[PDB]
A paper describes a structure:
By combining bioinformatic and phylogenetic analyses with structural approaches, we have discovered that the docking and dimerization (D/D) domain of the PKA regulatory subunit is an ancient and conserved protein fold. An archetypal function of this module is to interact with A-kinase-anchoring proteins (AKAPs) that facilitate compartmentalization of this key cell-signaling enzyme. The sperm autoantigenic protein 17 (SPA17) is a prototype of the type II or R2D2 subgroup that is conserved across metazoan phyla. In solution, SPA17 forms both homodimers and tetramers and displays a weak affinity for AKAP18.
Residue numbers in the entry: 7 to 72
The structure:
C-alpha cells in the first residue's frame, strides 16, 4: 500500500482534479486531466498568480505619471 508525504498544497491540487473528474465523468480520464491542468494554468495566468521568474525578461510594463 502506498502512503506518501507531499508538499503543502499538493493535496488540494489533486483534490481539485479529482472533484472535477467526478463531476464530469470523462470517458477518457487522462485526456481530461491534461485539459484540467491546462485550464487551471490559464486561470492562474489571468489572475496574475504565475510564479515570478526573476531571471526571465521583465516583459510586463507599469506606468504612472507625475
Amino acid at each position: 500500500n502506498t502512503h506518501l508525504r507531499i508538499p503543502r498544497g499538493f493535496g488540494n491540487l489533486l483534490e481539485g482534479l479529482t472533484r472535477e473528474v467526478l463531476r464530469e465523468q470523462p470517458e477518457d480520464i487522462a485526456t481530461f486531466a491534461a485539459v484540467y491542468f491546462t485550464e487551471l494554468l490559464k486561470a492562474r495566468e489571468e489572475s496574475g498568480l504565475d510564479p515570478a521568474e526573476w531571471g526571465a525578461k521583465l516583459e510586463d510594463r507599469f506606468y504612472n505619471n507625475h
